[PDB]
Design a protein around this ligand. Sequence first.
Ligand SMILES: *[C@@H]1O[C@H](CO)[C@@H](O[C@@H]2O[C@H](CO)[C@@H](O[C@@H]3O[C@H](CO)[C@@H](O)[C@H](O)[C@@H]3O)[C@H](O)[C@H]2NC(C)=O)[C@H](O)[C@H]1NC(C)=O
Lengths: 213, 210, 195, 224, 228
Amino acid sequence: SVLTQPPSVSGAPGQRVTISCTGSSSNIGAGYDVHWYQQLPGTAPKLLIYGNSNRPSGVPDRFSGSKSGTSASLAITGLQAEDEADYYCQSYDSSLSGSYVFGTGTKVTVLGQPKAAPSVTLFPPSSEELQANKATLVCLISDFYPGAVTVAWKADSSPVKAGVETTTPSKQSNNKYAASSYLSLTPEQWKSHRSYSCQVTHEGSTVEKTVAP
Amino acid sequence: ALTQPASVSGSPGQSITISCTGTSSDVGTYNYVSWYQQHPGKAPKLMIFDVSNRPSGVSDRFSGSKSGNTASLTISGLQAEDEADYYCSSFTTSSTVVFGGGTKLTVLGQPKAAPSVTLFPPSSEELQANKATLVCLISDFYPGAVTVAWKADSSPVKAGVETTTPSKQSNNKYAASSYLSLTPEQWKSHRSYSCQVTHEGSTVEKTVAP
Amino acid sequence: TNLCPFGEVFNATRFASVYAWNRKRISNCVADYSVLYNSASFSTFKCYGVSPTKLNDLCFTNVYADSFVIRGDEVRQIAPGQTGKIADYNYKLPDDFTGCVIAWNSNNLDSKVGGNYNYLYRLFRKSNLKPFERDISTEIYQAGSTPCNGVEGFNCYFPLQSYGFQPTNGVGYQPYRVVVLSFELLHAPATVCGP
Amino acid sequence: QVQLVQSGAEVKKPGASVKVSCKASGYIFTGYYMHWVRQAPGQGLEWMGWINPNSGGANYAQKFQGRVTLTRDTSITTVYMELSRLRFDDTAVYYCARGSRYDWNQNNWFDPWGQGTLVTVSSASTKGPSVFPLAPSSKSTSGGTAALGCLVKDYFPEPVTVSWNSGALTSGVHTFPAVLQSSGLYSLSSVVTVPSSSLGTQTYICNVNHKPSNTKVDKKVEPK
Amino acid sequence: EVQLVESGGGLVQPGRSLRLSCAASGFTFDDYAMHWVRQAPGKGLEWVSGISWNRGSIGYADSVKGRFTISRDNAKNSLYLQMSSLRAEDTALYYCAKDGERWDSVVVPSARNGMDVWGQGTTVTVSSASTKGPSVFPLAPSSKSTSGGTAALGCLVKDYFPEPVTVSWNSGALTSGVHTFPAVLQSSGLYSLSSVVTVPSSSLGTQTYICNVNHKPSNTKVDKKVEP
Ligand SMILES: *[C@@H]1O[C@H](CO)[C@@H](O[C@@H]2O[C@H](CO)[C@@H](O[C@@H]3O[C@H](CO)[C@@H](O)[C@H](O)[C@@H]3O)[C@H](O)[C@H]2NC(C)=O)[C@H](O)[C@H]1NC(C)=O
């Protein structure tokens, strides 16, 4: 089995947030405890809470945990600038030679700066690549916050999914995020149509960009 | 035991309320009344357990209510797959189950069909073995109520008649059979015999002669 | 120079039910523990109070072996301080327990298609069992105010159930054989010690 | 899945003793009470009693307080119900059902039910059937369809299997239920409707098989 | 002090076999139980296998049961994992953890204290494709990419393996305005990124721009001019 978790939770400094790890009749239905691990970006996972009620040395007093029925909950009161990381829940399972199961993972990020409007730009394949039997459209987006953006490629009247890829949002030195999306196809498929477009969606804000020969 | 009405009839789409009256030691103390449905020639199926909850695989057309010492089963949206026998049961305070008198749901809306009668005389082998049997078969009639009579040329025949109970066919119609046992002498002594069926005021006669 | 009957307990043909666990007193022999903690066949060898390395080189006054079979999801309750149905109604270990608990899966010797209902266990009781207390009574448990005086029914249940052991159950429902070796240290010349 | 199976139908005599077995498969057999429900032909349900397959106790109704016995067997997970000193009012269908849970809290409904076993108590002995051809005539035909059949009379017990040409003819067959005469012998008739042409050029043969009397008889129905 | 370091990592074409080791120091390795935890690149954790104080209790995941073999030797205070018949999903980062109880099992464990100490991680990449050089293409400005008086133009590198590739502009003379984004895995299993620069369009017709790409796995040194 697997443990379900919310995909993302955020908030403001000095505010109480909570994550819920829901199990089943085997993971938490039995007398099996649940532990909570915290993983910083680029570092190894750290043991945050053990035994679902205790706390190891080093962890501050803000992090708390409590289980009930077949579900546990972690709570962080008074968020700081050091608590933007990933959080996982772990428990054992006893079914067809069960094994240790982990949670989906929750990305806790503190909203230090409010939302903004991103800038987008599409570049089509150049003539050197057009003649190189290769084609790729790039839809680049910059200056968005937080890191939650989707990009969809659409022909004249139909969203296409053959050859879509989008990079994981990364952070720059200006604390803002940027990303790019690639549509890789053969030149004849692009030359046999009239127009293409990339649509970007960030926190509901939708922007379009159309490209035509 | 638990007292239930004899038979309830309703139109499709309407609502019928069957009242199962119990006892202060059966329905007054506990709330474990159950309603089972049984089709002709099958095992009783569990329909409602827990005067409110309904098991998986059961539609919403059936519901249960309770007020005081009398339970009730409410059926809404009658169809053809609802005509069966409904029984109410309950657990007494002495850990003993008690069933009801049984209720029969007759879904009104089916047309009236006249019976078809086939009459067969005793064969030659019958009288060759010192026996005689006249057969009167009734098929494709509705409802399941019909009387049978045996008539000699001018007389009634009451001794030596065996009539079964009407049973439902596969096409939701009924059928029955009647047998008249006599000796070859009595069969060859009279001129002719006749089987008469009576159904909803109508009568149909069939005659046979050697 | 006799040898302790360790094979008579681990390689036994049948084990008693958890509700009435068997008890074996070992003494007057030499204990060779090298076979125990170097067998790689037991799926659990936790020791409370000592360690398997130092256990061999320490004299013991007496030793008792309590063997039974329990489902897989109930092996984590045989420990000092734990609670549950098995820890309060079937087998209660003291808080100052100094001894070891071996456990190994037996899904090929205590199972049968269709269910094996030969191993019983207690479910209902009035109070909690004391450390090392045995109860084999089969009286009707009373949950309500009315006295049933020996007749089953509402508010009067049977305090003995049994697991439906089958070869198609998960690791949590598989029959694990458990053997608790307790060392009751008393005032004695330590008749039983290791080499 | 869970299921309960019973034994085959039985036929006895006044004064004998019947024993019905019920085997449960698919769950913990020793964790649910087992109830027995008796139903007379064309009558409402009747509660006989329950038994606990864990300890062995049993509780019967006041009507069957003296002449019933419920036993268990956990080695083969079966429950036996023995009814002694039978009468003429003891002919019925005996369903075995899974009743309440071990603590009378969760389950309080009879589910699932058995397939249903019949017990026919009677005084008549096993007698072979007698087949007679009900032949068609010019008076038993109208519109080009004539009826003809085979009558199975004076047999015991039930049931009997009547077929036409080893099961080839199926369009228009009708086997009426068996009547119970005043002597304890059953009689039924199986008829078929056929066009008149196949009455003049095709000869129909009915096959009657009675397994309790190991009888198999063919009969050719020809126009009288 | 408690640290675990794992070696034996690299790139192996699918179907081959690998051996991942893990040492230990600063504690009693003889007692505690050991486990393998793998994590996909940019995904959640996942359990692999586990041993506990002896070869009596050994557990495997439901997907690598018949492929991976875990072992240990208490003499040298180290554990091993022999993987074989690898697929396109085994590429991940591996950590060798330990339990929080002295004699806890793995098959029916008393799950308490969790896993305190984790390893640094070892990469296991399984790419059936072979190494090759990058293809470079210029993204030139047009009348559509003009905004705020500053037009963007750059160079796109595509279809190289493995990482990384260095990209510069004007041999280092041009520093301000450069943006280099991390490459993303393609469908064929390769990398592609783009280095862009945003410059006021007033210098588009006077100054030419040169993008220089350097790649060590293929010894590729390429200079490209980006013109309208
Ligand atoms: C319960 O029975 C088993 C099997 O009969 C006992 O395990 C056996 O222990 C003896 C101890 O000496 C082992 O003998 C040695 O085995 C090695 C390995 O093959 C061999 O090289 C030596 O020459 C010597 O024969 C024997 O192999 C082992 N049997 C198995 C199947 O592992 C066990 O000890 C018994 N229980 C108790 C409590 O004694």
